[PDB]
Design a protein around this ligand. Structure first.
Ligand SMILES: O=P(O)(O)C(O)(Cc1cccc(-c2cccc3c2oc2ccccc23)c1)P(=O)(O)O
Ligand SMILES: O=P(O)(O)C(O)(Cc1cccc(-c2cccc3c2oc2ccccc23)c1)P(=O)(O)O
Ligand SMILES: O=P(O)(O)C(O)(Cc1cccc(-c2cccc3c2oc2ccccc23)c1)P(=O)(O)O
Ligand SMILES: O=P(O)(O)C(O)(Cc1cccc(-c2cccc3c2oc2ccccc23)c1)P(=O)(O)O
Lengths: 299, 314
C-alpha cells in the first residue's frame, strides 16, 4: 500500500529540512545580528594574525567560528542572567521566548563545530582543532557554571579573589584561548599566557565599567553577580569586621532589584566604604603594566 | 611584587578546576540520575551489538555517550516545555534554577563529545565519528527547534501529518541514528538505519499517544500546547470536515496552557468522540509495527528487536 511505501521512503532518506525551516528557527540568532557587536573583534584576530600569519581565507573561517560561538553564547548568557538588554535592544529570549532561544543558541554551537572541518583536510591537524574546540568549550562551561552557582546560591559560597580569577581563567580565558589556540595550531613561544592575561583584564574591566557608567544601569547589580569589585568588597568587609556592610551588600545582591537608588547606594558603598572601585581600577592598571612594562593591548 | 607573581603563575598554568567544582556544577545532572527511569537503553545497545560486535570496552563508551546525551537532553527538554515532573520527581530546573540546569546540560553535551574522541585513534575513522556526532546533534536541534516553533507560534502554523513526521525524523530519529551510525562505523564485521528511523517514529508517536491515553485511563502535553501526533490529526481532521467550532475549541484549550483536568478531559473528549484521533493514532502505530512484523524478506531487520517492536504496539 501507499502508506507503507511513503513510510519506507521516509526512513530510507535523510531527514527532510528546508530553507524556510532554517529561517524560522534562526530568529533568536538573527535578532542579535541586528546590532553590531565590538567589531574590534575581527580587529583582535587580525592583530594576532600579524604573528600567526594564517592565509586570509583560513583566517576568515576561524573568525566565523569564533563569531558564531560568541554571538550565540550571548543568547544563553542573557537567559542565564535574565538580562533585559543586549547591544542596546531587547534580549532575544524576551522576544522569542526562553525555549526557542536555548535551542537556537545550542544549534549554533554545533554549526560552529561543523565549520572546523572547513579548516583542513589533514586528519591529524583536524583531530587537534577538534580537541582544542572541545577543551575550551569544556572550560567555558566550567567557569560559567561556577559564576551562575555562586550568584544563584548566594550566600552559600562567598568567592575569594583567587577563586574569582580561576573562574575567569576557565570562562573568559576559554574564549580567548580558543581563538588563539586554533590560530597557533593552523600556523605554519606560545601566546597563551599573554591571551590569558588579556582575557582577565577584559573581564575585570567589563565588571568595572558596568558599575562606573547598552545593558542598562549597573545591570550586574540587578543580576546579583559576584563581579570583581563585589568580590573585593565582600572579602574586604569580612576581613575588616564590617559585619553590617557585608550583610547589606549580600541583601542588595539578593533583591535582584532594578531600583536605581538602591543600585547607587551599593555603588557608593564600593566607592567610599570598601574602596573597591579604586582597588579594581588600580588592579586593572597593574595587569596592563605587566604587558606594557615587559599593539593589541591598547583596546 | 606579590600580586604580579601570583598573576604570572595563574596565566602560565592551565585553568584551575577542582573535584569540588565538578560536583557543584554536576548537581542538576546527578539529580536526574537519582531515578534511573526506563534505563533499558543499555539493552537496545547491547542487543544491536550482537550484529555489530564492538569490543566490550568500546561498547561501554558508546553506552556512556548515549546515556550522557539522553540524560542531559531531558534537562533541557523540561526547561523548554516548562515541565514540573520527570521520572516521578521535581524537574532539576525547578530545584537548581533554569540557569544552572542549561549550563550543566550543555557542559554534558561537550563531555559526551570528548568521549567520542576516545572511541578510536585511527585518524580517518575518528573524523567520521566526529562527523556523525555533529550531523545528528544538528538534526536533533532542527527537529526540536521546529517542534517548539509550532507550539510557541500556534496558531500561526498548523502542521500536517507529513510535516510532523519530518520533524520527528530530525528530532527523535537523531539520537537513534546517532547511536546506530557510531556503532556501524565502529563494527569490525545493509544498514540498520532505516530500521532505527522507523523505531524512532514509532517511539515518538506512541509517546504522544500514551501521554493522552494514560490520562484517559497528567496529560502534560496538553498543558504545554504541544502539536502532538493526535492533536495534529485532530486539527487537520476538523479543518477537512469544515468543523469550525471544534477546530477552534482544540486551539483554545492548547492556547490556555491549562493544568485544569476538566479542561484537559474536554479536549480528550473531542479527540475521542468528534475526530476519533486516539483510535486513528493507535491504528497508525499498528500499521508501522506491522511493517516490521510482516518483513519476511528482512528488508529492515537483520527477533529480540521484533519483540521490542511488538511491545511498542498500542
Ligand atoms: O559582542 P558584544 O559587543 O555584544 C560584547 O559581548 C563584547 C565581548 C565580550 C566578551 C568577549 C568578546 C570576545 C572575546 C574574544 C573574542 C571575541 C569576542 O567577540 C568576538 C566576535 C567575533 C570574533 C571574536 C570575538 C566580546 P558586549 O559585552 O559589549 O555586549
Ligand atoms: O563574561 P560576561 O558574561 O560578563 C560577557 O563578557 C559575555 C561572555 C564572555 C565570555 C563567555 C561568555 C559565555 C557565557 C555563557 C556561555 C558561553 C560563553 O561563551 C561561550 C562560548 C561557547 C559556548 C558557550 C559559551 C559570556 P558580557 O558581554 O555579558 O559583559
Ligand atoms: O530516560 P527516561 O526513562 O526518563 C524516558 O526518556 C524514557 C527513555 C528511557 C531510556 C531511553 C530513552 C530514549 C529516548 C530517545 C532515544 C533513545 C532512548 O534510548 C535509546 C537507546 C538507543 C538509541 C536511542 C535511544 C527514553 P521517559 O520519557 O519515560 O521520562
Ligand atoms: O521527544 P519528547 O520531548 O516527547 C521525549 O521523548 C524526550 C526526547 C526525545 C528525543 C530528543 C529529545 C531532545 C529534546 C531537546 C534536546 C535534545 C533532545 O535530545 C538531545 C540529544 C542531544 C542533545 C540535545 C537533545 C527529547 P519525552 O521523554 O520528554 O516524552
Amino acid at each position: 500500500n501507499k502508506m507503507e511505501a511513503k513510510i519506507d521512503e521516509l526512513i530510507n532518506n535523510d531527514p527532510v529540512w528546508s530553507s524556510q525551516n532554517e529561517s524560522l528557527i534562526s530568529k533568536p540568532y538573527n535578532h542579535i545580528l541586528l546590532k553590531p557587536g565590538k567589531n574590534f573583534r575581527l580587529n583582535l584576530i587580525v592583530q594576532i594574525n600579524r604573528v600567526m600569519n594564517l592565509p586570509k581565507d583560513q583566517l576568515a573561517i576561524v573568525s566565523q567560528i569564533v563569531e558564531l560561538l560568541h554571538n550565540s553564547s550571548l543568547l544563553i548568557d542573557d537567559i542565564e542572567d535574565n538580562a533585559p538588554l543586549r547591544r542596546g535592544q531587547t534580549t532575544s529570549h524576551l522576544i522569542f521566548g526562553v525555549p526557542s532561544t536555548i535551542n537556537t543558541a545550542n544549534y549554533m554551537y554545533f554549526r560552529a563545530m561543523q565549520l572546523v572541518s572547513q579548516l583542513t583536510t589533514k586528519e591529524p591537524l583536524y583531530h587537534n582543532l577538534i580537541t582544542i574546540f572541545n577543551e575550551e568549550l569544556i572550560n567555558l562551561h566550567r567557569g560559567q557554571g561556577l559564576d551562575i552557582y555562586w550568584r544563584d546560591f548566594l550566600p552559600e559560597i562567598i568567592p575569594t579573589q583567587e577563586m574569582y580569577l580561576n573562574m575567569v581563567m576557565n570562562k573568559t580565558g576559554g574564549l580567548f584561548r580558543l581563538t588563539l589556540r586554533l590560530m597557533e595550531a593552523l600556523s605554519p613561544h606560545s601566546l597563551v599566557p599573554f591571551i590569558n592575561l588579556l582575557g582577565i583584564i577584559y573581564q575585570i574591566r567589563d565588571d568595572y565599567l558596568n558599575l562606573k557608567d547598552e545593558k542598562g544601569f549597573a545591570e550586574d547589580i540587578t543580576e546579583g553577580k559576584l563581579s570583581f569589585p563585589i568580590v573585593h568588597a565582600l572579602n574586604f568587609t569580612k576581613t575588616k569586621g564590617q559585619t553590617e556592610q557585608h550583610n547589606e551588600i549580600l541583601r542588595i545582591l539578593l533583591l535582584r532589584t532594578s531600583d536605581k537608588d538602591i543600585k547607587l547606594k551599593l555603588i557608593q558603598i564600593l566607592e567610599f566604604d570598601t574602596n573597591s572601585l579604586a582597588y579594581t581600577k588600580n588592579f586593572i592598571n597593574q595587569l596592563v603594566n605587566m604587558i606594557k612594562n615587559d599593539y593589541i593591548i591598547d583596546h
